[PDB]
Amino acid sequence: PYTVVYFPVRGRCAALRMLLADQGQSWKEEVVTVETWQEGSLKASCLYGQLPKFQDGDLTLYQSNTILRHLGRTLGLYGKDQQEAALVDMVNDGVEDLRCKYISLIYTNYEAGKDDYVKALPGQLKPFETLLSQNQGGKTFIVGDQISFADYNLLDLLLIHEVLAPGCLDAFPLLSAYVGRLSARPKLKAFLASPEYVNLPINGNGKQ
Amino acid sequence: PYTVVYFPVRGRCAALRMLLADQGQSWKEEVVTVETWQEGSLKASCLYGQLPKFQDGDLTLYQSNTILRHLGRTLGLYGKDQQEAALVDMVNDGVEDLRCKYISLIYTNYEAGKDDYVKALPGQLKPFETLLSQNQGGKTFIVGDQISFADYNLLDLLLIHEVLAPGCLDAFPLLSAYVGRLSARPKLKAFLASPEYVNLPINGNGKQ
Numbered sequence: 344p345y346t347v348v349y350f351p352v353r354g355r356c357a358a359l360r361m362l363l364a365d366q367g368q369s370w371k372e373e374v375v376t377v378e379t380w381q382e383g384s385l386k387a388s389c390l391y392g393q394l395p396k397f398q399d400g401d402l403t404l405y406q407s408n409t410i411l412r413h414l415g416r417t418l419g420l421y422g423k424d425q426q427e428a429a430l431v432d433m434v435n436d437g438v439e440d441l442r443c444k445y446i447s448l449i450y451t452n453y454e455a456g457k458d459d460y461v462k463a464l465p466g467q468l469k470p471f472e473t474l475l476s477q478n479q480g481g482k483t484f485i486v487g488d489q490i491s492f493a494d495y496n497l498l499d500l501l502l503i504h505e506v507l508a509p510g511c512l513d514a515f516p517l518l519s520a521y522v523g524r525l526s527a528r529p530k531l532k533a534f535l536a537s538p539e540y541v542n543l544p545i546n547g548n549g550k551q
Numbered sequence: 552p553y554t555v556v557y558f559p560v561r562g563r564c565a566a567l568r569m570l571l572a573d574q575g576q577s578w579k580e581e582v583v584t585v586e587t588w589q590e591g592s593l594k595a596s597c598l599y600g601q602l603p604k605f606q607d608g609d610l611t612l613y614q615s616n617t618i619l620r621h622l623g624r625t626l627g628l629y630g631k632d633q634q635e636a637a638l639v640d641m642v643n644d645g646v647e648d649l650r651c652k653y654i655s656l657i658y659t660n661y662e663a664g665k666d667d668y669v670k671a672l673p674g675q676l677k678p679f680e681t682l683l684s685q686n687q688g689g690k691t692f693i694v695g696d697q698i699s700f701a702d703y704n705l706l707d708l709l710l711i712h713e714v715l716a717p718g719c720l721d722a723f724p725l726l727s728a729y730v731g732r733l734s735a736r737p738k739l740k741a742f743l744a745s746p747e748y749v750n751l752p753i754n755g756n757g758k759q
């Protein structure tokens with residue numbers, strides 16, 4: 344079945360985990376500790392010397408977005424046609440761009456850059472609110488009327504940002520309702536409330 | 552047909568341009584100058600306030616990789632099956648990671664970080680050489696036996712790096728032969744030698 348190999352943090356696996364759970368999929372968690380990593384063995388066997396590492400049968404994958412896309416392709420969470428597929432990518436790419444800045448803050452200069460980051464947030468979130476207003480008034484999903492991997496990724500982005508800047512979604516009604524709505528999905532809700540998710544720090548340096 | 556809207560630099564459009572050309576596709580180039588951009592009008596109309604912007608009929612896209620994936624999906628440059636598709640993403644994601652570091656150097660600290668960057672290059676390129684050795688001895692493409700958007704993106708990455716660190720491919724025979732082989736493809740060769748490509752600086756700050 345599936346197996347996600349990662350450190351004991353949500354980080355870049357949070358979204359794909361939400362997806363699997365929400366899709367009623369089963370997966371094995373291979374937890375890697377700082378000690379096991381600093382040993383070098385696993386690091387060397389990784390294509391880009393990094394985790395997450397993913398296994399689907401004998402198919403070994405690396406890169407969180409490759410996992411996301413893979414799951415979306417095989418599970419039918421990639422749009423109804425080529426057009427929607429492109430729109431899904433567009434959203435995911437934007438999520439990725441913002442996640443990189445987030446990651447950079449968290450690990451590069453949390454204390455010095457938090458203010459500037461939070462000041463810039465509105466403008467970084469605005470694109471997703473706009474996307475929402477152009478798709479059935481933000482009533483359904485980020486693209487089309489069926490959920491996609493971009494949704495789970497955007498949801499996570501949103502969630503981690505609420506922790507970073509409590510209330511950053513107040514100025515974005517569609518996003519706020521979107522988070523609540525998605526978070527309310529039965530399987531997802533149960534997952535999000537489970538110790539498996541709740542007891543994992545968002546990041547590995549203790550900053551959030 | 553297609554229309555790529557960007558600044559007069561190769562940057563994030565180089566790959567997708569190589570693709571179109573190589574695939575015998577026709578496209579219109581909407582050149583945006585620093586003045587036109589600093590006017591703010593076009594910037595505001597862009598989803599993430601950035602270029603490249605792409606048009607395929609009435610489908611407007613943003614994010615270079617979304618364009619790459621879109622073209623790969625519609626032109627059949629995305630693997631022969633879901634498995635290869637995942638592998639293609641995996642390669643592209645790695646290219647993207649390295650391109651971000653490259654971009655960062657070029658615009659953030661070219662003078663101070665060039666040495667450290669060039670010292671780290673071998674390790675950053677190693678993954679692509681390995682990928683190649685696992686696919687028919689690196690005789691065909693980065694994934695499978697048919698070309699994919701990841702190829703054009705990886706090719707560009709390789710090309711810009713040779714300029715950055717002349718000879719960085721000497722330690723990688725498969726990559727070297729790969730670059731030559733791909734660069735030799737008729738339509739691509741003609742494009743690469745054309746003024747349309749040759750007379751465009753790689754980056755917008757004059758550093759390469």
Ligand SMILES: CC/C(=C\SC[C@H](NC(=O)CC[C@H](N)C(=O)O)C(=O)NCC(=O)O)C(=O)c1ccc(OCC(=O)O)c(Cl)c1Cl
Pocket residue numbers: 350352354355377392393394395405406407408446450546547548644648
């Ligand atoms: C969310 C931020 C985090 C990235 S995951 C860990 C990192 N892997 C990647 O960055 C993969 C990026 C790919 N493009 C992708 O999958 O999309 C990694 O493998 N780091 C280890 C290494 O040696 O490279 C991150 O930046 C980060 C940094 C440091 C730690 O560890 C601190 C600790 O717990 O002591 C973690 Cl856990 C993370 Cl997540």
Ligand SMILES: CC/C(=C\SC[C@H](NC(=O)CC[C@H](N)C(=O)O)C(=O)NCC(=O)O)C(=O)c1ccc(OCC(=O)O)c(Cl)c1Cl
Pocket residue numbers: 436440558560562563585600601602603613614615616654658754755756
């Ligand atoms: C190759 C590096 C380059 C990025 S493209 C220009 C930039 N757009 C993006 O970064 C989009 C990112 C998406 N994830 C993607 O398409 O992949 C952009 O629109 N910049 C303008 C803006 O105000 O946002 C880059 O970093 C860069 C930086 C500066 C300039 O201009 C200098 C000059 O000529 O005076 C350029 Cl042209 C570029 Cl390309």
